[PDB]
Design an enzyme around this catalytic site. Structure first.
Site, mmCIF file in Angstrom:
data_model
loop_
_atom_site.group_PDB
_atom_site.id
_atom_site.type_symbol
_atom_site.label_atom_id
_atom_site.label_comp_id
_atom_site.label_asym_id
_atom_site.label_seq_id
_atom_site.Cartn_x
_atom_site.Cartn_y
_atom_site.Cartn_z
ATOM 1 N N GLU A 110 48.342 28.787 58.412
ATOM 2 C CA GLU A 110 47.129 28.495 59.181
ATOM 3 C C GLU A 110 46.626 29.709 59.954
ATOM 4 O O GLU A 110 47.411 30.584 60.214
ATOM 5 C CB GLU A 110 47.322 27.403 60.239
ATOM 6 C CG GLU A 110 48.525 27.643 61.161
ATOM 7 C CD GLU A 110 48.450 26.625 62.278
ATOM 8 O OE1 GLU A 110 47.399 26.450 62.920
ATOM 9 O OE2 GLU A 110 49.467 25.916 62.464
ATOM 10 N N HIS A 126 41.451 19.777 64.456
ATOM 11 C CA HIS A 126 42.883 19.798 64.684
ATOM 12 C C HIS A 126 43.785 19.151 63.650
ATOM 13 O O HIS A 126 44.656 18.360 64.041
ATOM 14 C CB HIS A 126 43.320 19.085 65.983
ATOM 15 C CG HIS A 126 43.331 20.140 67.080
ATOM 16 N ND1 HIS A 126 42.277 20.197 67.948
ATOM 17 C CD2 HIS A 126 44.195 21.140 67.357
ATOM 18 C CE1 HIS A 126 42.498 21.203 68.777
ATOM 19 N NE2 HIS A 126 43.645 21.771 68.440
#
Ligand code: ZN
Length: 108
Positions: free
Chosen positions: A71, A100
């Site tokens: 990520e 998120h």
């Protein structure tokens, strides 16, 4: 800095690494980053959090043996981290999340 979904996405697929404005969370902690205080811009000017292994515990991103998910934060400039992330696989698949890690859509 390269910190846009497209920018990062494209750099990854060509060069096979995140641009140099990225640092992992443990590297940032070591420099004085305190998550609760949102001070990254103060201790690591121009950097964004990126490069850490992303679990995929909830199997939301497509798997495959030998496939690892990482990520990187997108659109970050200063303060507390946002909810924008690029998720890239070891085979250069790129997915985006703006909420998120709840949902993901393919970008590359
Ligand atoms: Zn290469």
């Amino acid at each position: 800095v390269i910190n846009t979904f497209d920018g990062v996405a494209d750099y990854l697929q060509t060069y096979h690494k995140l641009p140099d404005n990225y640092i992992t969370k443990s590297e940032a902690q070591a420099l004085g980053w305190v998550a609760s205080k949102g001070n990254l811009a103060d201790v690591a000017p121009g950097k964004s959090i990126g490069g850490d292994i992303f679990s995929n515990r909830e199997g939301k991103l497509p798997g495959k043996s030998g496939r690892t998910w990482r990520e990187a934060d997108i659109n970050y400039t200063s303060g507390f981290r946002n909810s924008d992330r690029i998720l890239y696989s070891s085979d250069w698949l790129a997915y985006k999340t703006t909420d998120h890690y709840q949902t993901f859509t393919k970008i590359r």
